[PDB]
Design a protein around this nucleic acid. Structure first.
Lengths: 206, 50, 151, 100
RNA sequence: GGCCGCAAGGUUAAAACUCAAAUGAAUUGACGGGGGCCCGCACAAGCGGUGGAGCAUGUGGUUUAAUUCGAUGCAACGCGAAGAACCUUACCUGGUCUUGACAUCCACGGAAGUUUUCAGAGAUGAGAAUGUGCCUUCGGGAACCGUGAGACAGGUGCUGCAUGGCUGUCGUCAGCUCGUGUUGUGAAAUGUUGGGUUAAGUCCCGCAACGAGCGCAACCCUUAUCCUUUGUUGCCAGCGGUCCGGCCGGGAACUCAAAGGAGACUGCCAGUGAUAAACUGGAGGAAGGUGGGGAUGACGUCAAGUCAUCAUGGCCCUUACGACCAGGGCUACACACGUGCUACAAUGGCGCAUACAAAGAGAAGCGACCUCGCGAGAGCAAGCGGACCUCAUAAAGUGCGUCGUAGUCCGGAUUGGAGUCUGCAACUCGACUCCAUGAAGUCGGAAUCGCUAGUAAUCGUGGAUCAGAAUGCCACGGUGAAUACGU
């Protein structure tokens, strides 16, 4: 059977939104397109700085962006320069004054986007997928998670017939709405096609 | 929710808009200055009529 | 059903004469969610019948029903790839229901001008003990009598 | 969709913006009840003389991200598939799954 | 061949040729016109339909220059398409271009608005006006336009049996597995089986098993009963005005609006039962045994659907399978099927007069009052980004007449003549209006479908897609039934 999106089913109960503003029917489409372009540019530019979340807010007549990362040195730059460049270009794209802020990820071993990115990079570098998955599960469980699951699908190892594999540890109760479950996905491009990766992480009930 | 053909598979969404009204009758000179000087959060929309 | 219990649903008495039987009769005559039409038809027919018979409406109605109520019916069974018609008894509520349904079905298939006249004529014929409803009752009794060896 | 099919819409929008004022009233006096006997004959002729791509009814609403010409919602500027994806990822303020 | 027998036949007993297997016992599943126990609109008990007629609409076939592509037992056929006159477009006929309709690099010349000729248009040949920012720190070409050589751009072209992502179905069925211990040479087994019980692998008690994980239930939304807080654009019990209209002063009680709270737990009484889990009745309460409805889809099955929304390995074309333009087609018509609307009447048709709703939408938008037209509409022209204005009259019902069983005062296809609106343009191929014509059909063969309560049946109202085009899709309320002995 098909399952429902873990984050979407939980928005408004235990999960927040990634965008916050109020608009009438004349501005919704334009604001959405502007946000799409902003996020696209940022993801292209900071591809090597371990980014995991971009939060966009719009006060009266300005734009405010918050970036969550695990390598602030690269983003900030020496004596605050790269952030200035990014502010300039973001203002150019958005069309109004802009402000940029940075935030820290203490432990990239408990973040669902970063684990998926790491697995995808190793798969592109031709590591064995069983090792790639076991390492992630073990580190996550060592650093204090209450449960994790990892799934990988598509022409594994070069085989002619595709497959799907997964591993689990701990608790992952997807039917309980008061549970803090983090979820994200990523793709890998190899000489034989695409490979998909999914990660579930559990941190307790609220 | 399907890309091609299935017609009985659907999702339903809604957006809610909440509304509030305040009125002040006998003001002073400084109150209007403060009210026009104030600042609010990102997701709130405010309109003032004289 | 298999593992259920059926409870009675409260019925409400008719306005002028407080007759649950008459409320049921109006319900059975009713069609398409319209109740006032059926009530008007029933009251008009009952009034004309009372004028014709020189007795109370309740009494005329009860005599008509008594002349059409059944007492034994036939139920089908499958044995050895064949069909048997086993005779069985009838409960009072089922008696009432069958009588009313047969009366209405007979009335609806005549050729007078209005439904009120149809119903008045049918009820009068039933009271005199002749008509399609009594024919049906006789046929049921005969078919039950023909199969007494399978009791 | 195709790149050419995407370019066509840009052309149409530009021409509509260009000739809006001319088409608006200087040519639409045909509805005037006291203009003249046949000073509107020339109006109809020189209206039809203009480019065809300048009439607003030759534009089709397409999705901004993919180009799909079916299944369009005006509130969001997107098609159903992309609306669903953005909604699940959480990028449309105020939207959630509804029940009643 | 030998011996025996009346005969049927008995007894001793080979070779050539052909294959890589044939066989015994036991293990996990699946199946049985084998057995036992349970469940479900599965049968039974009832109420309306489809299969015949006319007309929407989709499909097979046939036809054509083309009738563009996909889905096609249950789980395709009002399906992708929440809306094909041009455009949309993907197909056909004809006219045209080759670094390109859409991008990054090099160089050489310059700068956007008005107007006339030939073209069906694409696209070729014409005039005057214009002088910009900047470092003018001297040319920067930064902005945009035109032209030449590639490096390249482009493909709704093929493979859904090379893939990612998303979806259908068994099925909201109660199941699917692991760690350590123990048994068997082993494939495996136990636990998960047994006595009761539940909607439920729900719970209790036993037993070489002791414990966990994904599912079940709860945490979420809405509906029904009460308390507190703030009373506008909403409300009008008591007081006074009045023009008899919440219209005025006023009031914060009630209906209502959306924020914090209380309430339902087998919690209490009796009986049955293993000192058990539970079961059958009663009291009080708005509500009683998971009170009603929704969201929520386990390990897996069908090489199930989608390269045409998107992305992507391999293959293929690149003066063409890649651009641009006018006119046609997807709307064809001997015929076969699936989903619907409207009838075949008196529980009714036509005329006049009058009760009672809920939920939604509005800026290139919704559009009142007044005047003109028999009508669809037209001309002036307030208010409204809205508990304020507009859409905007609910209909079935109720009272009084008329029709009197006729293919009719029932039904409304089809056709001629006059118009209206949106749109550059309604021939092929739009929706509405008035006058006239007035078809089949009289309850539908063998088959076959939905429904257990405010449900079925019936009557009206709104919204997305949208310049214009619903009988289809998704939502809202009014009136309101019959039956369940039983497996």
């Amino acid at each position: 059977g098909q399952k429902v999106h873990p984050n979407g089913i939980r928005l408004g109960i235990v999960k927040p939104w990634n965008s916050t503003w109020f608009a009438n029917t004349k501005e919704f489409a334009d604001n959405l397109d502007s946000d799409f372009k902003v996020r696209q540019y940022l993801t292209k530019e900071l591809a090597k700085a371990s980014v995991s979340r971009i939060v966009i807010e719009r006060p009266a007549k300005s734009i405010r962006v918050t970036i969550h990362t695990a390598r602030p040195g690269i983003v900030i730059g020496k004596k605050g320069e790269d952030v200035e460049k990014l502010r300039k270009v973001v203002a150019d794209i958005a069309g109004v004054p802009a402000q940029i802020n940075i935030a820290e990820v203490r432990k990239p071993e408990l973040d669902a986007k970063l684990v998926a990115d790491s697995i995808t990079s190793q798969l592109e570098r031709r590591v064995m997928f069983r090792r790639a998955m076991k390492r992630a599960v073990q580190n996550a469980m060592r650093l204090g998670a209450k449960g994790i699951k990892v799934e990988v699908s598509g022409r594994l190892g070069g085989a002619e017939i595709a497959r799907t594999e997964w591993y689990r540890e701990g608790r992952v109760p997807l039917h309980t709405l008061r549970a803090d479950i983090d979820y994200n996905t990523s793709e890998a491009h190899t000489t034989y096609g695409v490979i998909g990766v999914k990660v579930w992480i559990f941190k307790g009930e609220i | 929710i399907s890309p091609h053909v299935n017609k009985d598979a659907r999702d339903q969404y809604e957006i809610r808009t909440h509304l509030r009204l305040v009125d002040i009758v006998e003001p002073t000179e400084k109150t209007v200055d403060a009210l026009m000087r104030l600042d609010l959060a990102a997701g709130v929309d405010v309109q003032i009529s004289l | 059903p298999r593992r259920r219990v059926i409870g009675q649903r409260k019925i409400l008495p008719d306005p002028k004469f407080g007759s649950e039987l008459l409320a049921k009769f109006v319900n059975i005559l009713m069609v398409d969610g319209k109740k006032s039409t059926a009530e008007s038809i029933v009251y008009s027919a009952l009034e004309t019948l009372a004028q014709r018979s020189g007795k109370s409406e309740l009494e005329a109605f009860e005599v008509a029903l008594e002349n059409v109520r059944p007492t034994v019916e036939v139920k089908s069974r499958r044995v050895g790839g064949s069909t048997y018609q086993v005779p069985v008894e009838v409960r009072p509520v089922r008696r009432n229901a069958l009588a009313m349904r047969w009366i209405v079905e007979a009335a609806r298939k005549r050729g007078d001008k209005s439904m009120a006249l149809r119903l008045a004529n049918e009820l009068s014929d039933a009271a005199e003990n002749k008509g399609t409803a009594v024919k049906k009752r006789e046929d049921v009794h005969r078919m039950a009598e023909a199969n007494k060896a399978f009791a | 969709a195709k790149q050419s099919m995407k370019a066509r819409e840009v052309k149409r929008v530009a021409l509509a913006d260009k000739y809006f004022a001319k088409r608006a009233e200087l040519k639409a006096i045909i509805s005037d009840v006291n203009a003249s006997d046949e000073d509107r004959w020339n109006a109809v002729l020189k209206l039809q003389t203009l480019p065809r791509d300048s009439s607003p009814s030759r534009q089709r609403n397409r999705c901004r991200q993919t180009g799909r010409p079916h299944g369009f919602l005006r509130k969001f500027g997107l098609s159903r598939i992309k609306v669903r994806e953005a909604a699940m990822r959480g990028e449309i303020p105020g939207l959630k799954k509804a029940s009643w």
